[PDB]
C-alpha cells in the first residue's frame with residue numbers, strides 16, 4: 001500500500017526494517033508498531049557471536065530463532081547480524097589468537113549460517129574491520145592479527161556455508177565520502193570484486209549525530225559502491241534529534257540508488273533505542289509517529305509534486321481558500337489561530353522546522369492545548385513539546401504528533417475569522433491544506 | 437550577593453524559594469542546589485492534610501519536620517502548605533460533610549498551626565476554593581457544602597492559632613485578570629478586608645502552560661490585589677517549556693509590585709517536578725542551570741541597561757572585536773564556527789530563542805559535540821539537545837548548558853579564521869562577547 005513504511009518501500013522493490021529486541025516481543029505496544037511498519041528484521045543482539053556460541057563448539061540459537069520466527073511469521077525477511085566482529089565476542093574467543101582464532105572464526109561462520117542456511121536474506125559477515133584513526137587502515141584486533149586476509153576468508157567461508165545469502169561488509173562512519181575510513185573500505189571492496197572475493201553488499205550503519213553528521217555526499221558514497229557491482233543497504237539508521245529533513249534525505253539517497261536494497265532503523269521507539277538520549281528514531285516512547293515518520297513515508301511514496309515553502313510560507317485551507325492566520329498579528333501566547341484571506345504578512349508566514357514545528361514570527365509555535373477533539377490550536381513560545389510538533393501528510397492534512405489529530409476549521413467554516421482546532425482526521429476539505 | 441537567586445532577590449527586599457521533597461534530601465545534587473539558590477522553602481507534600489492528620493485527632497509531623505528542620509538549618513524561612521483544601525484529604529476526612537466536617541476542618545488548622553506556632557512566615561490557610569467552570573464561583577467540595585462561610589472561619593481560626601504568621605489564600609488560574617476565577621477571589625478578599633476577616637496575603641500559584649499561558653496583564657492582577665491591603669506572592673511557579681522571556685517577565689511583574697513578597701518555583705530540577713514532562717523549572721535533571729535560570733537571575737539583578745539583539749543580531753568578541761562567523765556561509769552540519777570581521781551577512785546573524793538556542797539561517801543551531809575542553813563549537817540541525825542550549829551571563833560570557841563551559845576563541849586567537857571551542861570559563865576577553 002502506502003500507509004506504512006514497509007509497504008511504501010515495497011512500492012519501489014525495497015524494504016524498510018528495524019532492529020528487534022527479543023525481550024520486547026512480549027510487549028503489545030511494541031509489537032503492534034513493529035509488525036505493522038516493517039518488512040525487514042535484524043536481531044539487535046540475539047544473533048551475534050557471544051549469543052550464538054557461548055562456548056566454542058556449543059551453539060545456542062534459542063533467542064535468535066525467537067526473533068527469526070517472529071519475523072517470518074509476521075511477513076519480514078531477516079538480516080543476519082553478525083558473524084565476524086571484534087566486539088561482543090564471547091570471553092573464550094577474546095583470548096584466541098593466531099591460526100586458532102582464524103579457525104574459530106571459520107567454524108562460527110559455518111555453524112550460524114548452517115543453522116539459518118537459506119533463511120537469511122542478508123548476512124553482515126564482517127562488521128567494523130576498519131579504524132577511526134584517520135589513516136583508512138584496518139582496526140587493530142585479534143581477528144586482524146590472524147592475517148590481513150581474514151575478511152576475505154570470512155566471506156569465502158560464508159559463500160560456501162550458504163550461497164543463497166547476500167554477503168555484506170558492515171561498518172559505521174563510512175557514509176561521508178571524504179573520510180579515509182570510507183575510502184579504505186571502498187578500496188577493499190573494489191579489490192575483492194576484482195580478485196573475485198564473494199561479497200555482494202556493503203552495509204552502512206548510518207549512525208548520524210553532531211559528532212559524525214549526515215552529509216549530502218552520502219548518496220555519492222552509495223553510488224560509488226553501487227558502481228563497483230555490489231548492493232548497498234542502510235543497516236542501523238538513527239539520527240540525533242530525528243530531523244525530518246535528514247531522515248527524508250537518507251531515504252531519498254537510497255531511492256536515488258538502484259542498488260540500494262532498503263533501509264533499517266536501529267529500533268522501534270525512542271525508548272527502545274541504544275541512544276534514547278538522542279531520541280533518534282521514528283516513534284516516540286508513547287508509540288506516536290514523529291514528524292520524521294511522515295517525512296520518511298512521504299519520501300518512500302514519492303512525495304508531492306512541486307517543492308514546498310522551504311522555510312517561510314503560507315498555509316492555505318483547501319475548502320476555504322483562506323490562509324492560516326494569527327489574529328491581528330498578535331504575538332500573545334494563547335492566541336488561537338484563524339482562517340483569513342491570504343496576503344503577504346508575517347502573521348501568515350509559517351516555517352516548518354526539521355523538528356516538526358510550524359513557526360511564526362521566528363520563535364512562536366503552532367501549539368495544541370490538549371489532545372482531544374475540539375482542542376484549540378494557538379501560538380505559544382517554542383519549547384519542543386510534542387503538542388508543538390506536526391506531521392505534514394501527503395494528502396494535505398496536518399497532524400499533531402502528540403494528539404494524532406488533524407488541523408480542522410471549526411464546523412467546516414470558510415469565512416474570515418473561522419477558528420482552528422484539533423479533530424479526528426476525516427479527509428474533509430476543512431482539514432486539507434496546500435500552498436498559495 | 438547577586439550570584440544566586442535567593443541573594444539576588446534579597447537585593448529588592450524579596451525572597452526566592454522552592455518546594456522541597458523530604459525524600460530527595462539525601463540526594464547531594466538536589467541539596468547542593470536547593471541550599472545554594474533558595475532562601476524560602478515550601479513542603480511539596482509533607483504539611484498537607486493527609487500527611488499531618490492521618491487519623492482524626494491523631495497528628496503526625498515527622499515528614500513536615502524533616503523539611504522544616506532542613507530549611508532552618510540552611511537559613512531558609514518556611515511557607516506552610518496547606519491547611520484547608522478539597523484535595524489530598526485523608527480518607528476519614530473525605531467521608532465527612534456538614535457540621536462534623538466543619539469542626540474537623542477547624543480541629544486540623546488548630547493542631548497543625550499549634551505545632552508550628554511562631555515558626556512559619558506564611559501559611560496557605562485555604563487552597564483552591566474557587567471553581568474553573570469560568571463562573572468565578574466557589575468550587576463544589578465537601579468543604580464548600582458545610583456553608584459558604586467556611587473560608588472565613590478557616591482564616592479566623594488561623595489568626596487565633598498563630599497571630600505571628602501571614603495568612604494566605606492560595607489558588608491557580610487566578611493570574612490572568614480577565615478570568616472570572618481571578619475576579620471571584622478578588623471579590624472575596626475585598627469582602628474579607630471590609631468585614632475585618634483576617635487575611636494578609638494572596639498566593640498566585642502561577643502554573644503556566646499552553647492551557648493557561650502567562651499574560652502580561654498579570655502585573656495588573658498583582659497590583660489590584662496589592663491595593664486591597666494584602667501582600668501577594670508567586671507561590672508555585674513553573675512554566676511549560678521554561679521560556680526565558682516568560683520567566684523573566686513573571687520575575688519583573690513581581691518586582692514591579694512593592695507588595696509582592698517573593699517568588700517560589702515548584703521544584704528544584706525538572707526531574708523533581710510534578711510535571712517533568714513539561715520541563716518547567718530552572719534546573720536540568722543533571723543539576724545544570726537552564727537558559728531560564730540566567731534570565732531570572734538577570735531579571736532579579738535589574739537586567740541590562742540596553743535591549744538585547746531582539747530578532748537576530750551579531751555576537752562580537754571583546755578580545756578580538758570580530759564576530760561569530762559560520763565559515764563561507766556554509767549551512768553544512770558539522771561546520772565549526774569562527775571569528776571573522778563583522779559584516780551584514782546572515783552567516784553572522786544569531787538569534788537567541790526562549791529555549792536558549794543560538795540559531796543561524798533560521799533552523800541551524802550553535803552545537804557542541806562533546807562536553808570537554810577543546811570540544812569544537814559548530815552548527816547542527818536544531819533538535820533541542822542541551823548541547824544546543826546556552827546561557828548569556830551578565831559578565832558577557834556564553835556558557836553551554838550541557839557542558840557548563842564557555843565559548844572560547846582558541847589560543848586566545850584574534851585574527852580572522854580563529855576557531856571557537858568549549859573551555860573552562862575564564863574572565864578572558866576571548867570568552868567575553870558584546871551584544872551588538
Ligand SMILES: OC[C@@H]1O[C@@H](O[C@@H]2[C@@H](O)[C@H](O[C@@H]3CO[C@@H](O)[C@H](O)[C@H]3O)OC[C@H]2O)[C@H](O)[C@H]1O
Pocket residue numbers: 373374375408409410411412421423426428430
Ligand atoms: O467541546 C464542545 C464543543 O465541541 C467543539 O466545537 C465543535 C467542533 O469541534 C466541531 O467540529 C467539527 C466536527 O466534525 C468534523 O467532521 C468537522 O470537520 C469539525 O469541524 O463542530 C461543531 C463545534 O461546536 C469545542 O470543543 C466546542 O465548541
Ligand SMILES: OC[C@@H]1O[C@@H](O[C@@H]2[C@@H](O)[C@H](O[C@@H]3CO[C@@H](O)[C@H](O)[C@H]3O)OC[C@H]2O)[C@H](O)[C@H]1O
Pocket residue numbers: 457480481563564608641672708709710
Ligand atoms: O509523582 C509523584 C510525586 O508527585 C509530586 O508531588 C505532587 C505535588 O507537587 C502537587 O502539588 C500541588 C500542585 O497543584 C497545586 O495547585 C497545589 O497547590 C500543589 O500542592 O500535589 C500532588 C503531589 O503528588 C512529587 O514531586 C512527585 O515525586
Ligand SMILES: O[C@@H]1[C@@H](O)[C@H](O[C@@H]2CO[C@@H](O)[C@H](O)[C@H]2O)OC[C@H]1O
Pocket residue numbers: 132172173205207209210211212
Ligand atoms: O559502536 C559504534 C560507535 O563506536 C561509533 O562512534 C562514533 C565515532 O565517531 C564519532 O564521530 C561519532 O559521533 C560516534 O558516534 O558510532 C557507531 C557505533 O556503531
Ligand SMILES: O[C@@H]1[C@@H](O)[C@H](O[C@@H]2CO[C@@H](O)[C@H](O)[C@H]2O)OC[C@H]1O
Pocket residue numbers: 044045081127128172205236274
Ligand atoms: O543493545 C545494544 C545494541 O543496540 C548495539 O548494537 C550495535 C551498535 O553499534 C553497531 O556498530 C553494531 O553493528 C550494532 O550491533 O550493540 C550493543 C547492545 O548492547
Ligand SMILES: O[C@@H]1[C@@H](O)[C@H](O[C@@H]2CO[C@@H](O)[C@H](O)[C@H]2O)OC[C@H]1O
Pocket residue numbers: 568608609643645646647648
Ligand atoms: O489539580 C489541579 C488541576 O486540575 C489544574 O488544572 C488546570 C486547569 O486549567 C488549565 O488552564 C491549567 O493549565 C491546568 O493546569 O491545575 C492545578 C492542579 O492542582
Ligand SMILES: O[C@@H]1[C@@H](O)[C@H](O[C@@H]2CO[C@@H](O)[C@H](O)[C@H]2O)OC[C@H]1O
Pocket residue numbers: 810844845846847848849859862864866
Ligand atoms: O589546544 C590548545 C587549547 O587547549 C588552548 O586552549 C586555551 C586554554 O586556556 C584558555 O585561557 C584559552 O582561552 C584557550 O584557548 O588554546 C590553544 C590550543 O592550541
Ligand SMILES: O[C@@H]1[C@@H](O)[C@H](O)OC[C@H]1O
Pocket residue numbers: 341343345
Ligand atoms: O492588506 C490587507 C491586510 O492588512 C489585512 O490583514 O488582510 C487583508 C489585506 O488585504
Ligand SMILES: O[C@@H]1[C@@H](O)[C@H](O)OC[C@H]1O
Pocket residue numbers: 761762763764765776781783
Ligand atoms: O565565513 C567568512 C565570510 O563571512 C567572509 O565574508 O569571507 C570569509 C569567510 O571565511
